[PDB]
Design a protein around this nucleic acid. Structure first.
Length: 72
RNA sequence: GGUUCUCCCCGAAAGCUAUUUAGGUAGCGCCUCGUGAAUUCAUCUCCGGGGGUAGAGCACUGUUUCGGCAAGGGGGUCA
């Protein structure tokens, strides 16, 4: 019977493979569009980057303090 | 610059804001899939609205041509 067990429907998806033909859908850059920083290998912006504008976590003021008694 | 098998369904944008930013990027707008909702939404009819655009006009702010009345101004009679 070892060649009769099957998984539940919807348990597997087979993943996404990029750049494998036209009919496969996401080929020819595999869904990352045309030129640009995001299209490059290893490209992208770090967390909180807004394109040069002051990030939200920098526009706002830090407040409060940590209490050691709260951890005990 | 290149990115390799197939079929089915839906289907954009080239805008705004910010950026040592302008051929990059972030949020929003636009696309897709899922979930939940109210005759929610669109077209038409009727009703209630506020505009100052087209047009027009010259009361006002400016500009413009002609004619009249013409304060006033010059020369001339004077006491």
């Amino acid at each position: 019977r070892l060649n009769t067990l099957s998984p539940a429907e919807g348990s597997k998806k087979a993943g996404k493979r990029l750049g494998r033909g036209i009919g496969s859908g996401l080929g020819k850059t595999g869904g990352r569009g045309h030129k640009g920083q995001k299209s490059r290998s290893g490209g992208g912006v770090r967390r909180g980057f807004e394109g040069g504008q002051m990030p939200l976590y920098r526009r706002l003021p830090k407040f409060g303090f940590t209490s050691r008694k709260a951890a005990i």
